[PDB]
């Protein structure tokens, strides 16, 4: 993502991309900070977040059968 948020501000998921980029291009050591790719793509899709909330509700529901 570039910077231009849909309403004239630093986009919701920029800072993460900026850190990802400065680390991937500054210290070119091999994928030592591919750790930030998960973070940036999470910001883009919230995948881990939705998964966690879904599982919380799953267990909440499972304890209802009791």
């Amino acid at each position: 993502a570039s910077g231009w948020g849909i309403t004239g501000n630093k986009g919701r998921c920029y800072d993460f991309w900026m850190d990802f980029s400065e680390c991937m291009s500054r210290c070119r050591e091999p994928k030592d900070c591919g750790l930030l790719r998960e973070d940036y793509l999470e910001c883009l899709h919230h995948s881990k977040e939705f998964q966690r909330r879904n599982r919380i509700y799953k267990e909440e529901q499972r304890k209802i059968r009791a």
Partner: protein, 153 residues
């Protein structure tokens, strides 16, 4: 709700576009597809592109198609994939979205002003990315001189 209405209308109207005969019927259903797609975009929260879909997609292209199919009127010579993408457990279960509905954190600081999408789009498109805007001039010029050299005797 209304989102589903527009989606269903667009779907069935595209079906009629491809299948229904009397090509003028097809062009009518095509106009209808574009109208409901514009309403959909309006629902999405992008107003400028909705009015543009109205102006250039419907009011400009579809009128050309209607003109041409008029002058030649006598020229009459998934549920599996939907389930596979809805059983992923990476989409929030609507029960979750209920309580979290009262959890969003307004900022009150990025909305002291507010760029409507028209204004920000103008900013971006003309200051930066301008060659991306010069090229479409060339493709429009190609369109018009092509129409001329092709049909104009």
């Amino acid at each position: 709700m209304i989102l589903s209405v527009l989606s269903s209308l667009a779907l069935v109207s595209g079906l009629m576009v491809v299948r229904a005969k009397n090509p003028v019927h097809s062009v009518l259903f095509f106009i209808l597809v574009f109208c409901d797609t514009s309403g959909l975009l309006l629902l999405l929260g992008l107003d400028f592109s909705a009015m543009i879909f109205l102006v250039v997609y419907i009011g400009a292209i579809a009128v050309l198609f209607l003109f041409v199919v008029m002058m030649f009127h006598i020229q009459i010579a998934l549920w599996w994939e939907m389930f596979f993408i809805l059983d992923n457990e990476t989409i929030p279960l609507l029960p979750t979205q209920i309580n979290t509905t009262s959890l969003i954190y307004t900022v009150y600081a990025g909305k002291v002003r507010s760029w409507t999408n028209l204004e920000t789009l103008g900013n971006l498109l003309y200051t930066y990315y301008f060659v991306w805007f010069l090229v479409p001039s060339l493709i429009l010029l190609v369109a018009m001189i092509g129409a001329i050299v092709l049909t104009m005797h």
